[PDB]
Structures are given as structure tokens and as C-alpha cells.
Amino acid sequence: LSTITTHHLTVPPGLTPEEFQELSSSIAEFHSYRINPGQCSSLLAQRIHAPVETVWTVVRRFDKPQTYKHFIKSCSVGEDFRMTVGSTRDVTVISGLPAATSTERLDILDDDRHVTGFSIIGGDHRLRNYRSVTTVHGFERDGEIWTVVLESYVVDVPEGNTEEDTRLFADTVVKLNLQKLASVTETLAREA
Amino acid sequence: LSTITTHHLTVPPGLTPEEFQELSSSIAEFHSYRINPGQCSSLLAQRIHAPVETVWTVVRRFDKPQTYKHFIKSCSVGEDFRMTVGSTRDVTVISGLPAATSTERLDILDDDRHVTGFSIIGGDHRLRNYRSVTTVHGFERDGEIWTVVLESYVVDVPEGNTEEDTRLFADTVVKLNLQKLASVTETLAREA
């Protein structure tokens, strides 16, 4: 019943075909998931007019997701926290429901290829077993540079929800966070 | 136990003191509420670099809230719908919870003073008895014009939530929608 995601075969909304053809191999490598019934997966994309390493400095900051994410009341890490795979963070989410904290584990951190990813290991019943990967990519035309960020996830569809409603919620949130990422990092680039 | 909101006595975040002093009378008139225990109220503000009537054209469009609001899957009005006080709209919200539609009634529509407001009369248990008012205001300095939008609400705090968590949720959503309003209407002004 399990299948393989097809994100690497379709142009993500927002991206040009030409951008996608350059990214196709990277989507297969980092944005491919094993999907079972009762699960759903999406790939989202955002163009940013900022250098790759400027964007990556924000995307890799596992201890401060609120720097580019919405609906975060607080994020606490350990006193001996170090940016290593396997570290965790406790994220308190604003949702209008009673106070709910998610524990998230850092799954990937590749400073050379600009790939990171995390898993919600407990605490969010909207996004049970959420797993996500973000990659950053540089582009150039005629001395003009820009960056594309790709963010994908897989998550369990909660009992009582349709896939479309879980997908639409999770997509809307990723889309909004990527917009904030674009604004934050574009500002950082203009200021130098 | 009931008190009166104090939004007209504090500078809203984002606004300058000078802007507030010009708006103080309008906040008292339109952004004042009777507040009971178990209720909470906020006033949010957004500067927009667009003419008042450009902003008002979007803010008054009760049948298309998705034009400037986030997390809206659909909005349906009647076949014989007319922009009159007492009309309703059914708004389907993206929330990661099972499909939930809110029925909202148009409470105020003043095209001369640029005031509108609505009530959720059923269908959202996060925002039970939510009531909101939006006003639009023009400003000028040395031939440069800009607009300030004020949006306030009162809502019931759900049983099991703190006031701070209901306030933070509702504030975050209003803030994000006002940002979208700013981007949408600024684009409309640049295009003419």
C-alpha cells in the first residue's frame, strides 16, 4: 500500500520549470519520502533575493526557529545545547487550543550542502510524526544571484480529518514561514 | 465585574505616539468594548503606504475576506447577497482540525467614515462570540500620504485556555492578516 512521493517529478508552485530542472536531483535525494495510507506529504518552494549563505545562517539555527517561523510562543533548548544531530528543542505553539509544546529532534545538518531537517517526536496531535527537510540552493543569471529554499514534510493524517485538510493546514503554515524567511533574510542582505 | 476596554489610552504597537493622538477619539468610538470575566480584547494596527480609499475597497469586501485574510479555504454568501448590515457569510477555516465553517454577520458598514465590523455567530469554538471592528484612517506629511488600519476584537476565552493563549492566537492572526492587507493594497496602489 506504501508508495514513494512524486515531488521530484512536478514543478513546485512558485518555481520556474528552469529552476526545477536544476533542482530535480536534489528533490529526489532530500525531498523523497516513504508514504503509507493515512499519511500525506508536500513540497513547498520560496525564491529569496539573498545569498545562499545568508539564508542558510537562518535556516540552520535549530535553537531559534522563531527567527523565521510564525505561531511560536517560545523555544527552549538545553543548557548544554550544541548544534548536533540528535539534539532536541521544545517549541510552544500558538494555536488557540490549550498550551501545547512540541519536542522536536534535529535529524540532518549538512553545512556543506545546505540541508537540514527535523522530526516532531511528541506533543503536537495536529502534526503527529511530522518529519521535515529544508534545503537551500543558489542560482545565477548574468551576475544576478538569488536563492531557492525547498521545504518538504511528511505527516500522519489525524483520525477524523481528510488528507486535504491536513495538507492545506501544513502547507499554509510552511508557505507563511518561508515568506517570513524571505523577508528576514532579504533584510539581512540589504543591511550587510 | 464588567469593565471597559482601555485601547484608546495606550499606543498600539507599531503606531507612533503622534499617529495615536490623532486616532484617540476614533479608538474610543469604534474600538471600545464591554468586557466581562472570561473575555479578552485587543487592538491591532498596521501602517499602509496606499491611499485610504484603495485600502477601504478591500476592507469593505465582506464577501471576499480571503482577499486579505490567511487560513481561509472558502467563503460563500447568498445568491441574493447584497452588501448590507445583517448579511451573512460562511467562512471555512484552515486549522488542521476537522472541517469547521463559521457563520459571520456584517454588523457595521460606513463607507463615509470607513468603518466595518462583523460577528461570528456560530461555528468556531476557538473564537466563540468573536466580534470585530476595522477602521481605516488617512495621514499626511509634506504631500506624502499613508493609511493606518485599526482592527480590534472581543472574544470569549474558551474553557481550559488562559486569556494569554486566546489573546496570542487571535492577535497573531489579526497581525498576519493586516500584513497581507498591507501587501495586497500597496500592490494595488503601485499598479493604479
Author numbering:
A (entry chain A), B (entry chain A): 28 to 219
What does the paper say about this structure?
The binding of the plant phytohormone Abscisic acid (ABA) to the family of ABA receptors (PYR/PYL/RCAR) triggers plant responses to abiotic stress. In the resting state, the PYR/PYL receptors are monomers or dimers and display a wide empty ABA binding cavity flanked by two highly conserved loops, named as gate loop and latch loop. To investigate this issue, we have selected as a model SlPYL1 which is a tomato dimeric receptor with known structure that is involved in the induction of stress responsive genes and drought tolerance.
To investigate the relevance of this amino acid on the receptor function, we generated a mutated version of SlPYL1 harboring a Glu 151 to Asp substitution (SlPYL1 E151D) at the latch and studied its biochemical properties and compared them with those of the native protein. The overall structures of the apo and ABA bound forms of SlPYL1 E151D are nearly identical to that of WT protein with the differences confined to the area of the mutated residue. In this structure, the apo form showed that Glu 151 and Arg 153 established a salt bridge that blocked the ABA binding pocket while, in the ABA bound form, Glu 151 pointed to the solvent enabling ABA binding and subsequent gate closure. Instead, the analysis of the apo form of SlPYL1 E151D structure revealed that the shortening of the Glu 151 side chain to Asp disrupts the geometry of the salt bridge with Arg 153, weakening this interaction and favoring the transition to an active receptor.
